[PDB]
């Protein structure tokens, strides 16, 4: 039968769809995906889900449209879905109930064949192809299946909706109940079964009448593409009876639903309407939070859909994976200069100041969510201030990162207030509820933020940080409402030392202005100091003039290939397929590293001027080393992977013991003595080692490992080079090292 309004005939669709629901297997999906193969040898996926639901009575069947797509002879339906949801959904539910019936007439007992057939069945097709957010939504697709992302602002309280009337038992004494099946409600003039009152005033008992949940959910899409000038848009939503309350305020949900368009009234007295319809989205399915908190539930059966959703994590969350892409990934991971390479691969236009890039990269992979049943909220990510002499790429690095990440929210300082930093709540008097608004920090829930002129920020502001940075929550308490909105977000602030540059006659923690609490709050502080080198200076000048040479300049730095686009998907794979477990050996070297950090910081006059190593130093070391191990796709933290973490934390501090003001205008006498004693000992060994030849490595294990920590061993290279000039020994091939006759 052809449809007068869609010309999409039913019989063929239902017929193909039936054996579609019986021919379905995991493999179709795998072939399109191209991922490595079993799924218990590809059992029938749909009968799996169908049996499970029949036994659980969910009557809701989640479905990824790409699955139905990846099967032969169904793409017709796969597109008609995107084009005729209003009826393909109907025929889908019909087929669902009918295959339930065939299954139960094959499967002896379930619902006695009737309780099943009585209750309806709804389908939940999600992930039909992510549309291009709001500003793309065309009035040409008024009735199509859109996918939208973005957090929700406000949820109207549960609103009932008439479904079946229950009309007043008249003096005739036989109440009558009737549904509506449209926006119309008909009350029969005559009274009840007997026409005791043919003329009658039938009334309605609006308490026993059934109802249906209709929740209106405003939505503010993610600022993935919002160019400038306009605040990210908003698309009101409606939800019908099963996904209701699956989305509280503040959540970061994703939705797949049909677009709609309805006129409005102006006077509301006369029946005349207005052109320029208003629009919303009748949702169909809601990807729950796109998060992994899993503290407690929110709603009814819907959580069963959430459990059916979370298990397929790999392809659905990567949104793209191929072992040619994954092979490229593992290959890159194999490359040795990785930590260097990817560093520059973040901001290729940025010059030699690599350690900044390193810290930034480590921020991108930030930490792992260790969720405790007791305690909890251990700020899974990190936070990086950076400061230094004006005009030193800081602000541009921030721009660069904010562009890199898929969730960044740029923001300035001193042009912003505490409300801007942490959403502000409003008791809406319309429905007397809690709405949240414009959290700059909340927009960045997940993924980094950026903040400039951090010093120039007001003291009235720069106080919400004192909370959000260490608990990732904001506890607002004003006249109407008290609440705590959690905003997990890795801040990344620029700065400017007081005045307009250093004063290497001034203490460092005074040269930075911020108070020590908020300062130690920052996981990692950089001091990008400007030098008068004249050795890098001309290199930098060339590094600018070259980009000015071309018209459309690319790869401003050395011409080494680096994957400007690949690295983003690389990151969004790493942060989600690997969770570093801190092995035992790491624990030791981490503890000793902390102890050494703190004992060094010890002093009597370190109290007022220095930055003291405190427990957050250990938090930094651990949350940062596990991020390093997440990089390189390492599944478990090694021991030689916290060492560079220590190095990075020491980027700021290396050069002062009792008083700050590093100074350190970079061959020392104590270095002379070091080389000299090493020469003594190594000559004594090689003259005691009668087999006069041994490798540099063997010699190192002979001496440099007998006791406490190994030495550079390139200072050993200079030692043996001296012993070549002096000719006390002879390398005699790289494999060994002999002495002189």
């Amino acid at each position: 039968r052809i449809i007068w309004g869609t010309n999409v005939s039913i019989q063929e669709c239902t017929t193909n769809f039936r054996n579609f629901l019986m021919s379905f297997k995991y493999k179709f999906r795998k072939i399109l995906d191209e991922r490595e193969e079993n799924t218990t040898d590809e059992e029938l996926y749909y009968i799996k889900q169908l049996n499970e639901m029949r036994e659980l009575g969910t009557s809701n069947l989640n479905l990824d449209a790409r699955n139905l797509l990846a099967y032969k002879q169904t793409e017709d339906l796969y597109h008609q879905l995107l084009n005729y949801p209003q009826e393909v959904i109907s025929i889908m539910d019909q087929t669902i109930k009918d295959c339930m019936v065939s299954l139960i007439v094959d499967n002896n007992l379930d619902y006695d064949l009737d309780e099943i057939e009585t209750k309806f069945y709804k389908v939940r097709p999600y992930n039909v192809g992510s549309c291009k957010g709001m500003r793309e939504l065309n009035p040409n697709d008024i009735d199509k299946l859109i996918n939208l992302k973005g957090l929700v602002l406000r949820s109207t309280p549960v609103i009932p909706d008439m479904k079946v009337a229950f009309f007043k038992c008249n003096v005739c004494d036989h109440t009558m109940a009737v549904e509506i099946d449209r926006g119309v409600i008909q009350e029969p003039a005559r009274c009840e079964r007997i026409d005791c009152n043919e003329p009658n005033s039938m009334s309605l008992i609006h308490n026993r009448c059934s109802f249906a949940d209709k929740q209106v959910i405003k939505l503010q899409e993610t600022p993935d593409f919002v160019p400038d000038g306009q605040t990210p848009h908003s698309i009101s939503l409606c939800v019908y009876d099963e996904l209701v309350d699956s989305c509280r305020a503040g959540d970061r949900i994703e939705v797949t639903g049909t677009f709609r368009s309805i006129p409005i009234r102006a006077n509301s007295r006369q029946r005349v309407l207005k052109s320029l319809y208003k629009t919303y989205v009748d949702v169909v399915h809601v990807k729950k939070v796109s998060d992994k908190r899993l503290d407690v539930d929110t709603s009814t059966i819907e959580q069963e859909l959430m459990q059916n959703k979370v298990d397929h994590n790999e392809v659905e969350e990567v949104r793209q994976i191929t072992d040619q892409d994954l092979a490229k990934i593992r290959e890159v991971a194999a490359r040795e200069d990785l930590y260097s390479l990817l560093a520059r691969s973040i901001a290729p236009s940025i010059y030699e100041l690599e350690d900044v890039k390193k810290g930034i990269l480590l921020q991108l992979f930030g930490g792992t969510n260790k969720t405790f049943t007791k305690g909890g909220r251990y700020r899974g990510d990190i936070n990086i201030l950076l400061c230094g002499d004006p005009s030193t790429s800081k602000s541009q690095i921030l721009q660069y990162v904010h562009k890199i990440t898929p969730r960044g929210v740029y923001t300035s300082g001193k042009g912003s207030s505490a409300v801007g930093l942490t959403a502000y709540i409003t008791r809406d008097v319309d429905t007397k509820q809690l709405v949240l608004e414009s959290g700059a920090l909340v927009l960045s829930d997940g993924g980094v933020c950026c903040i400039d002129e951090f010093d120039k920020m007001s003291d009235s502001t720069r106080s919400v940080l004192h909370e959000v940075m260490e608990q990732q929550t904001i506890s607002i308490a004003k006249a109407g409402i008290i609440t705590t909105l959690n905003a997990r977000s890795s801040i990344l602030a620029s700065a400017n030392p007081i005045g307009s540059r250093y004063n290497p006659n001034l203490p460092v923690t005074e040269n930075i202005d911020l108070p020590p609490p908020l300062l130690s709050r920052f996981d990692l502080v950089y001091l990008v100091l400007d030098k008068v080198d004249e050795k890098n200076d001309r290199e930098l000048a060339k590094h600018l003039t070259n980009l000015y040479l071309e018209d459309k300049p690319e790869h401003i730095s050395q011409d080494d290939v680096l994957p400007v686009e690949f690295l983003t998907m690389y990151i969004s794979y790493a942060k989600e397929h690997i969770h570093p477990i801190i092995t035992e050996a790491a624990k030791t070297e981490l503890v000793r590293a902390y102890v050494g950090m703190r004992k060094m910081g010890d002093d009597s006059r370190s109290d007022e001027k220095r930055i003291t190593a405190t427990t957050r130093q250990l938090e930094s070391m651990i949350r940062l080393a596990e991020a390093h191990a997440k990089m390189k796709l390492k599944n478990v933290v090694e021991l030689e992977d916290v060492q560079e973490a220590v190095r990075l934390i020491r980027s700021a501090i290396k050069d002062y013991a009792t008083d700050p003001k590093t100074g350190k205008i970079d061959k020392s006498v104590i270095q002379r003595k070091l080389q000299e004693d090493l020469s003594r000992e190594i000559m004594n060994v090689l003259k005691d080692q009668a087999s006069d030849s041994m490798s540099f490595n063997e010699l190192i294990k002979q001496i440099n490992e007998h006791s406490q920590d190994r030495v550079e061993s390139s200072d050993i290279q200079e030692a043996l080079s001296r012993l070549q000039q002096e000719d006390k020994v002879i390398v005699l091939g790289e494999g060994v090292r002999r002495s002189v006759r």
Binding site: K370, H466, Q471, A477, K478, A479, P517, Y594, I622
Partner: protein, 254 residues
């Protein structure tokens, strides 16, 4: 009669008072001073009125003040999740009016009425707070009556009323200079007036200093925490049976 056996156990044991105090902060490391201060908080006094003359307070207000990284916010964001009917407010974000009571208009009768606020909806429970120092005096003031007189009194927009707020309070403000000079004294070091310094019937200026036989233990502890697998953190008494044991002990009025 069954649960009587469970209490009977958890109360007839000899060292409960110790078994309890080292089992209030399973994650936190040590601080056997403060943990005691909290365990006593959830167990109020008697608040029994005097001769018909007057009524006196029967509640305790511990007020930690500590150097950086002393795990002082952990105690709060724990208590407020374990003490019944409690509330956590950052303070500086909030305002004094919000903290005690709000006056607001309603369209039902076109009249002014009361908003409970943190203090009134925190009745008979701990109402923890953060960063007093950051809370400008404009809001520090609005608490005093919920400290000693135990009740708030408000005369605004025509409505005069008085609501009793039997609420334990807390605090976690940081010293003036973030960290406080061991050099300087304590007088010109806390930056808070005399009264609100007195009304706190505890005081814990927590320090933070260097050591080896301490910092090693602390680091091992934090690591074991971040090593989920090594959640050997199980204290004697769970964070649940402690609740029922309290809900019993709340009734003795010795």
């Amino acid at each position: 009669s069954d649960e009587i056996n469970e209490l009977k156990e958890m109360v007839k044991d000899e060292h409960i008072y110790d078994k309890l105090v080292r089992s209030i902060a399973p994650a936190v490391f040590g601080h056997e001073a403060v943990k005691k201060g909290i365990l006593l908080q959830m167990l109020g006094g008697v608040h029994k009125s005097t001769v018909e003359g007057i009524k006196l307070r029967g509640d305790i207000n511990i007020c930690v003040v500590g150097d950086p990284s002393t795990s002082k916010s952990q105690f709060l964001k724990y208590v407020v999740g374990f003490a019944p009917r409690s509330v956590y407010t950052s303070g500086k974000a909030s305002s004094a009016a919000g903290l005690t009571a709000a006056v607001v208009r309603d369209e039902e009768g076109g009249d002014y009425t009361i908003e409970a606020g943190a203090l009134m909806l925190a009745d008979n429970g701990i109402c923890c707070i953060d960063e007093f120092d950051k809370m400008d005096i404009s809001d520090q003031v609005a608490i005093h009556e919920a400290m000693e007189q135990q009740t708030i009194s408000i005369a605004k927009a025509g409505i005069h009323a008085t609501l009793n707020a039997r609420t334990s309070i807390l605090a976690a403000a940081n010293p003036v200079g973030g960290r406080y000079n061991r050099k300087l004294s304590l007088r010109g070091n806390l930056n808070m007036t005399a009264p609100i310094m007195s009304r706190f019937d505890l005081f814990f200026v927590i320090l933070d200093d260097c050591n080896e036989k301490i910092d090693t233990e602390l680091a091992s502890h934090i690591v074991d925490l971040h090593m989920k697998r090594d959640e050997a953190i199980e204290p004697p008494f769970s964070a649940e049976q402690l609740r029922r044991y309290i809900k019993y002990a709340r009734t003795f009025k010795p």
